[PDB]
Each structure stands twice: as C-alpha cells, then as structure tokens.
Design a protein around this nucleic acid. Structure first.
Length: 535
DNA sequence: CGGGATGCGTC
DNA sequence: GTCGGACTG
DNA sequence: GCCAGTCCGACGACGCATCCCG
C-alpha cells in the first residue's frame, strides 16, 4: 500500500515545479495544501519538500557528483566542469544524461518517493567513492532524467523553489511552523497533526529532550534603534564569541544541541554532565540556553574563537571548556518560554549555583536610559570584547524569532577596514551563475615584489551593480588594476592566505573607491601593522 | 604512508 | 557569521 | 508610495575529518 499516484516522483516533481513557477508564497503554500488535501504519504512529501531543513549528510557536492557520474556515463569529466559554470549540478547532470549512448534514462517514471527516501538513507551511509557510484547507479538506472535531476537536488539540500520551512509547514496546519520551532522534530509534528485530523467526522508546546529553535539576535545599528525596541529597558550581556549550546537534561540523561540543532561534538561537552547537577541542585529536568567557551583557567580570560577545535583545545595547558548560561527555557517539567526574561533570569539565580570556570551566569547589567548604554558600547569595544547582546526586559522566549539585539563595533556608523586590490574571479552558483559573483581580494607586496592574497569576497554588491561589473573587469581566465574597500568583524590569521597569514572575518565590501587605483591601496607591511593594533 | 582533494560545521 | 532581494499584511 | 517583520538564497575564514590515489 505505497502504490497510489500521490507517492510517485512524477507527482512530487509536479508539486515542485508548480511551487517554483509561482512567486507568491501565499499561493505556494496553497498549492501544497491543495495537494495534501485533494490529490498518499504525508510525512514523506513534507520531508522531501524540505531537503534543506531536514538535512541528511551525503558527503557529495558539485565536484564529487561530477566525478562519479562521468564514470557511470562513460564521458569526459572536463565538459561537465565547464557546465558547472552555469551553476546548477542538477541541470548539468540531466543534460549529460541523454548524451550517454551507454547509460540511457529510464523509459517511464516509475519511482515511489518511499524508494527515493529509502535510497537517500542508504546513500547517506556511504562514504567511499566505489560504494557511492554503485548506489547512484542503482537509482539512476530508474530515472526519467526529470527524475534524476530532482534526485540530485534532494542530495544538494535545495529544491530551487523558494519555499522553505515556513511555507511548506503552513500547508500542514495553521500552527505547524510555530509548533515545529518549539519542538523541532517533523515526524512528531505530523504524527500530532494526523492524531488531530483523525478525530472530526494543534498546540505549540516545547518537549523535553527535543530541540527548540534557538532565539535569535537582530543586528542593531544605533543606540537610537536599540532604545526604541526596548521600551521597557533591557538587559545587556557581553556577546560571547563562542558556540551556542542548548542543554537539555532529563534525570541524568544530557543532550547538547548546537545553533543548527546538530548534536554538539562531544569533546566540548562531555565533561558538563559532571558539573550541571552541582550547578542546579534538585533540577531533575531543564533546558538551558548558553554559550560554550574555552577558558584560560590561570587568568580567567576567555580564548579567541578558533580555540574550540580539538587540536587547538589540546595546545593549552591551562584550560578546560566552560559554559555561560544566559537563559532558561524549561525546568522541572514546566516550560518558561512564556515568562518574561526578567522573570526567567530571576529563576536562574534563584536556582543555579555558579561553579568556578565551568558553569557561569552570563553577566547582564540592567540598562534603561540611552547614555548609560552608549557608554557600555564604548567600555566594551575598549578591550576588544566582541560586542553586546541586548534583550528587552519583559520579552518572552520566542523560538526562532530575531527579537534580541546584538551590537558590534563594525555596525555603528569604527570598523576594521582595508582598501584592497581585486585580482581574480570565480563563478557564482544558481541565481548568480555563469557570472563573476565572487572576487579575490589581495594586496601588493614590495618584499618579493609579487602580488599577495588576503580574502575572497562576494557580499556588498547589489544585482544592478554586479551585472555592470561583468564588463569593467579584466580577464584572468587561467584556472589550472582595480581596488575596493572591504570590511569585516576583525582580521584573522592562519596558514592559508599568502599575506603573512592574515584574512578577514565576515568579509563584506562597503565602498567602491574610484580614487586609489593601486599604489594607494594596502600593501603587506601596512596590513601587518593594521592587524597588530587590535591587540 | 603521507600529500592532496573534497566535504562538513562552527561562527 | 554576511549580504541583497524579495512577499505579506 | 511607504513601512517593519521575515523569509530565501548565495556567500566568507577557519578548523577539522575522511578518502584518494600515487
């Protein structure tokens, strides 16, 4: 009983093709809705509808996919590579799927979406090239091409239809989206909607041990701005340059979710099962929202961002990892997402005991009047602490919603900055495609008197300006001057960009400087200096 | 057996 | 993390 | 016309894991 029409790739594709060819979200979700109501497996169509939200790792991508299919097709992998420049592997494959006077497409579309899901599962367990090519072949040899194309889009986590979770889930129930954010497990949502739809003839609760879409922070560009959105005053916390960790604990089972709700790599969380119970006497269950950091144990100071790597962790003889708890969503079987922050933070202090260098309250001063805030921004840029995170006081806990504020030096107006020389180019993928979307930014060096690399750059430019840029730029084609102001959070060091080892955290481009055609742009020792002033 | 590619996941 | 560009009410 | 609240895609540096293939 998986053999009805609604379970066919052909129909699934129909669905995908329709939604993409229809630019209003209102109608996109309507489309899905009609389909789920009129005309088949519910869980799977919604799941397959969200390859980028319900992610399975295949260890494949443009490069490898092309390698492996040139093998099954018996054709030249150079030609496919040129075709990768239009920026869509799915299309690139389908085209090279009739060319094969050796591996021809199937006669008719006969795949049931269960088989595609069962396939993807088993694909995801593969890791050696041999095994993958096989699997891929097993499936590919049952595909209308139309089929195959779709199925590599699934592999690629992107159905190119402009409908993400919100819009797909809205077809499922007035509250599916909201409910999903509070307990982020699709199968459970559907099970719940089908138990509801059952009894005729959907409540948004958080569930202990299953992830909650963490609450988010909006970029806030001025004090004026922050003041407006916190009409009740705010709590100002220091912005930990760490990794967000949501802790769930149930009796003595502990689980640790990351920002993306993936489990946290155990080497940065394995030791907390030991402290938390001491941090929280008589808290059998709870869900905490925190940041994890590697702390310098001999000085109290936290260590910079990269430092959370296993081998980096390992270099320091001073530190183990530490947790800064800045929120509490749930505790002893009761959700607190609805309570206002001011009440939640109160509960924290009222129930947690700080344990030295492991489990730590995040420091949050009340701020209430503009001047007092603007001082704090200055006070904190001073010793290069990343920024601030400001939260309204009466605010409740709203999963997934960007309602907190984050402030950092590069936002107001004060930003780390380099007027860099553009050298090279790369093709963009998709919407941007067959174009020079990305750019290679570097500096001249009077040392070896050769040119030098600092960071790539894509952001900054609007669509209208990008297409004009297609012309004004010289033609470095070999894959085997002009000058831009680029702008980032900081300046980083590592053994990868030729320039001594320096680079830009979140490189963006701001000004297009029509003045300083080389020579006046930055050179190695100049930048070498720039970096060091931030220390 | 060890460099090179490719991919993943954290900001 | 960044950014530019959309659809909604 | 305009908003603001939110999505959606198309992207960066770093640190790391695993497989390849000579």
């Amino acid at each position: 009983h998986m053999r009805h029409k609604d379970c066919l790739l052909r129909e699934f594709r129909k669905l995908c093709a329709m939604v993409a060819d229809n630019p209003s979200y209102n109608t996109k979700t309507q489309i899905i809705q009609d389909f789920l109501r009129k005309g088949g497996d519910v869980y799977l169509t919604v799941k397959l509808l969200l390859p980028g939200v319900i992610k399975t790792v295949y260890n494949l991508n443009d490069k490898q996919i092309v390698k492996l299919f040139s093998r099954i097709f018996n054709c030249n992998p150079d030609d496919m590579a040129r075709d990768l420049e239009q920026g869509d592997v799915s299309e690139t494959i389908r085209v090279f799927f009739e060319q094969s006077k050796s591996f021809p497409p199937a006669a008719k579309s006969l795949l049931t979406i269960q088989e595609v899901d069962e396939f993807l599962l088993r694909l995801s367990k593969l890791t050696k090239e041999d095994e993958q090519q096989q699997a891929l072949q097993d499936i590919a040899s049952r595909c209308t091409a139309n089929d195959l194309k779709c199925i590599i889009r699934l592999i690629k986590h992107d159905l190119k239809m402009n409908s993400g979770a919100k819009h797909v889930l809205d077809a499922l129930d007035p509250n599916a989206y909201e409910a999903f954010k509070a307990s982020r497990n699709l199968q459970d949502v559907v099970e719940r909607v089908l138990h509801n739809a059952q009894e005729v003839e959907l409540s948004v609760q958080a569930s202990l041990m299953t992830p909650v879409q963490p609450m988010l922070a909006e970029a806030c560009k001025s004090v004026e701005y922050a003041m407006k959105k916190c009409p009740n005053g705010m709590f100002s916390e220091i912005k930990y340059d760490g990794e967000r960790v949501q802790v769930h604990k149930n009796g003595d089972h502990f689980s640790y979710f990351s920002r993306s709700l993936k489990p946290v790599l155990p080497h940065k969380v394995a030791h907390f099962k030991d402290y938390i119970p001491q941090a929280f006497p008589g808290g059998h269950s709870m869900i905490l929202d925190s940041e994890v950091l590697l702390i310098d144990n001999k000085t109290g100071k936290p260590l910079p961002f990269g430092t959370l790597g296993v081998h980096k962790k390992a270099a320091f003889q001073d530190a183990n990892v530490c947790l800064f708890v800045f929120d509490c969503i749930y505790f002893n079987d009761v959700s607190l997402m609805d309570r206002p922050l001011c009440e939640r933070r109160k509960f924290l202090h009222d129930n947690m005991v700080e344990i030295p260098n492991r489990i730590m309250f995040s420091e949050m001063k009340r701020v209430t009047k503009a001047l007092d805030l603007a001082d704090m921004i200055t006070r904190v840029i001073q010793e290069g602490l990343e920024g601030l995170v400001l939260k309204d006081v009466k605010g409740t806990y709203e999963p997934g919603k960007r309602h907190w504020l984050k402030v950092k030096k590069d936002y107001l107006n004060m930003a780390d900055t380099a007027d860099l020389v553009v050298l090279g180019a790369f093709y963009g993928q998709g919407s941007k495609g067959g174009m020079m979307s990305i750019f290679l930014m570097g500096c001249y060096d009077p040392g070896s008197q050769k040119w030098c690399t600092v960071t790539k750059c894509a952001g900054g430019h609007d669509d209208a300006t990008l297409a004009r840029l297609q012309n004004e730029l010289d033609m470095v084609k070999i894959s085997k001057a002009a000058v831009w102001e680029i702008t980032g959070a900081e300046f980083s060091k590592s053994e990868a960009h030729t320039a001594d080892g320096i680079s830009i955290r979140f490189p963006r481009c701001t000004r297009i400087r029509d003045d300083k055609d080389w020579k006046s742009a930055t050179n190695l020792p100049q930048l070498k200096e720039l970096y060091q002033l931030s220390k």
